[PDB]
Design a protein around this motif. Structure first.
Motif, short mmCIF file in Angstrom:
data_model
loop_
_atom_site.label_atom_id
_atom_site.label_comp_id
_atom_site.label_asym_id
_atom_site.label_seq_id
_atom_site.Cartn_x
_atom_site.Cartn_y
_atom_site.Cartn_z
N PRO A 1 0.73 -1.43 -0.12
CA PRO A 1 0.16 0.31 0.11
C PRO A 1 1.19 1.56 -0.29
O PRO A 1 0.27 1.97 0.95
CB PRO A 1 -0.71 0.02 1.08
CG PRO A 1 0.06 -1.04 2.16
CD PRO A 1 0.34 -2.51 1.17
N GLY A 2 1.32 2.17 -1.31
CA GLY A 2 1.71 2.99 -1.39
C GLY A 2 3.31 3.03 -2.04
O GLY A 2 4.55 3.97 -1.52
N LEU A 3 3.46 1.39 -2.15
CA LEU A 3 5.45 1.69 -3.10
C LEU A 3 5.57 2.07 -4.60
O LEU A 3 4.81 1.71 -5.38
CB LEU A 3 5.57 -0.14 -2.50
CG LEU A 3 7.06 0.10 -2.85
CD1 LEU A 3 7.90 1.30 -1.95
CD2 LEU A 3 7.52 -0.85 -2.00
N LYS A 4 5.45 2.75 -4.72
CA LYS A 4 5.60 4.11 -6.20
C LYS A 4 7.23 4.27 -6.31
O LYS A 4 7.97 4.34 -5.76
CB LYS A 4 4.66 4.93 -6.12
CG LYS A 4 4.54 5.80 -4.97
CD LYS A 4 4.82 7.67 -5.55
CE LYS A 4 4.80 7.69 -6.81
NZ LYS A 4 4.70 9.08 -7.06
#
Ligand SMILES: [Mg+2]
Ligand SMILES: [Mg+2]
Lengths: 127, 83, 99, 151, 100, 112
Positions: free
Chosen positions: E93-96
């Motif tokens: 949830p949030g790894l870009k």
RNA sequence: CGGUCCGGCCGGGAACUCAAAGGAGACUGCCAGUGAUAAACUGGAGGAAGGUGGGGAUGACGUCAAGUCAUCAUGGCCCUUACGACCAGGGCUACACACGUGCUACAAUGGCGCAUACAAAGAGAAGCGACCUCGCGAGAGCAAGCGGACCUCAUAAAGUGCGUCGUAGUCCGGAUUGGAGUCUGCAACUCGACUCCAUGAAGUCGGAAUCGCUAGUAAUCGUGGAUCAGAAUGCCACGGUG
């Protein structure tokens, strides 16, 4: 009175509050001499009021907060310019005609992976 | 190193064997397998065959080794010159 | 006296979550302080994408964490119940403080 | 650069007195980002030289630079591994830059109590064409003018 | 991902989570100078014949899904090769990918 | 003057002059002067001459040139005679603190 | 603006720096020359920025039976009372050697010490760990606060004003050595790091060759981050000077 500016340069940021009277520059509480060591810097922060003639006819009061003498020394100038402009605006010319109105964006690039200092590259083992 | 107040690290069994040796008065070597154990003053006067995997190397412990490890006297590599 | 800390990763959904509590407070009460966005925490990681041997293949990722404050200084008899009876959306985390 | 041909960048006006020549001298004399102590040293040396020569500081610096000013750059435009150099005339800006670089290099070459004293002593010699700058100019000019058949 | 090594690691947790209280109190006693020499020696001698492989600082942090003994990350509990395919698929949830 | 059996140079600072003794570095030199009443910015000359003999007596509070030399020699010889790892790595010309004698045994093996 | 213990402590506020959300915004848009009445290039004007405004990911069909069946899965061989499996002690850290890379130094812009200054971004509950009592020093005991714009790591330095040394294997250079404790994890002889007393090496800009950089970049100074009981000159980032 208080004509204000917000000079910026490197990771620094000033806050000049020019008013009308007599030098009395004062930075981050300390006076100029006390605050800035490198006498060089103690001239960038007096350059603008030289291109006009208010070195001794105006007051001041700054509070820079970021960076190092490196560029805090400069943010003052930018600001002292933005605010000088708000004193009369007819000065815009001379001040732009001297480079004191642009904010230098020169920043500091990032260490990229594989390099070792942004650009410098590990020495190559010949063959 | 270890804390001054924690104490030495002599083995449960090694202490029993050296106590047996010292009140039996036997001159036979006492073989030990421990290598990180410290030394006690009561072993002065006994032959200890310490094991490092190759041979039970003998140590005729003097009165000049108490405050260190007995394993310093027995290296494990085999090298006394390139040629 | 009572406050909620909202923690999320999406500014397009944490804002909706903040709206769904600030409007609830302004409906079943008043005296709100609005959404205060705290400095978001970004944690960076360099990951090698080389299976056996390549000391050049790196990927630079970052994980975001967005924090907001919603404090209602003066509560009524209905504010606490209205803000606790909510069907909170998934993904966001609430730290409520009622001192 | 093959296609990108750039101009010449601008430097600070050297607010000590105000001179592009002085600013360039300072920024070539400084090393390791020590511009503050470099300015202190060069200004002390120039102020001593002013009294030592009897003229103004800027005028005495300019004439001392002119008296040791070179004219020819000996570059290496050989077609390959074979040694085939070529002397050519120098543009005025690079001429002044090379002259002041030779001055600041002789300053490091000759040692004394302090770099300010070294600079003062070497400027007091470049005033009447002595020291190291004029010798280097002569040593470059002799080998740049002795090879005239090679164009 | 060796099966032989995948059991010793779980034993080193299933045994280290049981001796927590005794080891903690023993460490506190032998660390506080306000103790007795005989009691400290008896305590350290009792501690040392406890099973060796049950010590907390005697197990290498092993990866969760593949058990790679190198590059174990605290944040994800996974090695680099697996966290790559996880963040690339989009389960974190949030790894870009990033760019400062 | 000549302190501790060695003629220390007269035209050097007292700290540097007394540092020449085999057994004192840059710290014990300051410590002895502080404990005996000697400044750290004066030469051997322009100083009390009885202070020379007071310092000659004071430097006997610990090891001295000959004492340190013989102590080092006897320690090394005792290690050699005991024959432990210390002695084995001492009477062979190799580091003993676990340094790699593979690519950087370069002032133990000497120049090659 | 006001009290004020001289500290933003609050009374207050949202002009600002900062905090995160949505935008205006540089597009050859202009005036002149050149060019083919083009595209474009060059100047200048405004402009915060000018010609891609400035940095990063995004690696086009394909080449190297390129590299990993040692992250993993995997069609076949394979061992099935051992190539499967058991824990303790060693060795992966050794060595007459040659090599890639880097840190550390060559000393007067340089080391010795005493006021004194300005950063960003970070990590924190089996945790981060303020004080205080101590220790020449490592850290010992007691130990506040804090999933943190609150507390810690963390008086950053180079800079600056003084003094001082004076060109010497040097008050340079800090390695090897005997011993001492400390952090740390049941245990540092093989094999940690820190410490400070003591010996104080080499080395004094280095052949042929050779590599990196075109701007806030080279070059110097310090700090931060992940691995992990501790064990970075390696790795990844951050700003100061310039
Ligand atoms: Mg333009
Ligand atoms: Mg570990």
């Amino acid at each position: 009175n208080q004509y204000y500016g917000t000079g910026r340069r490197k990771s620094s940021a000033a806050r000049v509050f020019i008013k009308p009277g007599n030098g009395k520059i004062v930075i981050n509480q300390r006076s100029l001499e006390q605050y800035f060591g490198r006498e060089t810097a103690r001239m960038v922060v007096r350059q603008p009021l030289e291109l006009v003639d208010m070195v001794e006819k105006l007051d001041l009061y700054i509070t820079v907060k970021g960076g190092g003498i490196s560029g805090q020394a400069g943010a003052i100038r930018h600001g002292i310019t933005r605010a000088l402009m708000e004193y009369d605006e007819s000065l815009r010319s001379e001040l732009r005609k001297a480079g004191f109105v642009t904010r230098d964006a020169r920043q500091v690039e990032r260490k990229k992976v594989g390099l070792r200092k942004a650009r410098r590259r590990p020495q190559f083992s010949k063959r | 190193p270890r804390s001054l107040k924690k104490g030495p690290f002599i083995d449960l069994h090694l202490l029993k064997k050296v106590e047996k040796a010292v009140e039996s008065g036997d001159k036979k070597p006492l073989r030990t397998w421990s290598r990180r154990s410290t030394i006690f003053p009561n072993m002065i006067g006994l032959t200890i065959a310490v094991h490092n995997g190759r041979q039970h190397v003998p140590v005729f412990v003097t009165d000049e080794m108490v405050g260190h490890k007995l394993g310093e006297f027995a290296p494990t590599r085999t090298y006394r010159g390139h040629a | 006296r009572i406050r909620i800390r909202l923690k999320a990763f999406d500014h397009r959904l944490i804002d909706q979550a903040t709206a769904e509590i600030v409007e609830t407070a302004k409906r079943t009460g008043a005296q709100v302080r609005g959404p205060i966005p705290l400095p978001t925490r970004k944690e960076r990681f360099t990951v090698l994408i080389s299976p056996h041997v390549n000391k050049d293949a790196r990927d630079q990722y970052e994980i975001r964490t967005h924090l907001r404050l919603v404090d209602i200084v003066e509560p009524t008899e209905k504010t606490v119940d209205a803000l606790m009876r909510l069907d909170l959306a998934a993904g966001v985390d609430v730290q409520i403080s009622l001192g | 650069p093959r296609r990108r041909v750039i101009g010449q960048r601008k430097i600070l006006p050297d607010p000590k007195f105000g001179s592009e020549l002085l600013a360039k001298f300072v920024n070539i004399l400084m090393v390791d980002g020590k511009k503050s102590t470099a300015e202190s040293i060069v200004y002390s040396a120039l102020e001593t030289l002013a009294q030592r020569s009897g003229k103004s500081e800027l005028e005495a610096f300019e004439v001392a630079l002119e008296n040791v000013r070179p004219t020819v750059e000996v570059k290496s435009r050989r077609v390959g591994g074979s040694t085939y150099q070529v002397p050519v005339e120098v543009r005025p800006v690079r001429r002044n830059a090379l002259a002041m670089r030779w001055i600041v290099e002789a300053a490091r070459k000759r040692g004394d109590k302090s770099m300010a004293l070294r600079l003062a002593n070497e400027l007091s010699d470049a005033a009447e064409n002595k020291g190291t700058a004029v010798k280097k100019r002569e040593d470059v000019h002799r080998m740049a003018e002795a090879n005239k058949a090679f164009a | 991902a060796k099966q032989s090594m995948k059991a010793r690691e779980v034993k080193r947790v299933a045994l280290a989570d049981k001796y927590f209280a005794k080891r903690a109190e023993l460490k506190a006693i032998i660390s506080d100078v306000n103790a007795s020499d005989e009691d400290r020696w008896n305590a350290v001698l009792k501690l040392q014949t406890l099973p060796r492989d049950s010590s907390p600082s005697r197990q290498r942090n092993r990866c969760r899904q593949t058990g790679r003994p190198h590059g174990f990350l605290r944040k994800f509990g996974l090695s680099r090769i697996k966290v790559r395919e996880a963040a690339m698929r989009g389960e974190i949830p949030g790894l870009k990918k990033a760019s400062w | 003057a000549r302190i501790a059996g060695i003629n220390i140079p007269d035209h050097k600072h007292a700290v540097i002059a007394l540092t020449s003794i085999y057994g004192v570095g840059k710290t014990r030199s300051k410590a002895i002067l502080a404990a005996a009443g000697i400044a750290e910015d004066v030469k051997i000359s322009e100083l009390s001459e009885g202070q020379i003999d007071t310092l000659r007596d004071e430097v006997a509070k610990f090891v001295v040139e000959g004492d340190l030399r013989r102590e080092i020699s006897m320690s090394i010889k005792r290690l050699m005679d005991l024959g432990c790892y210390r002695g084995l790595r001492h009477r062979r010309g190799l580091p003993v603190r676990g340094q790699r004698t593979k690519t950087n045994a370069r002032t133990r093996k000497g120049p090659r």
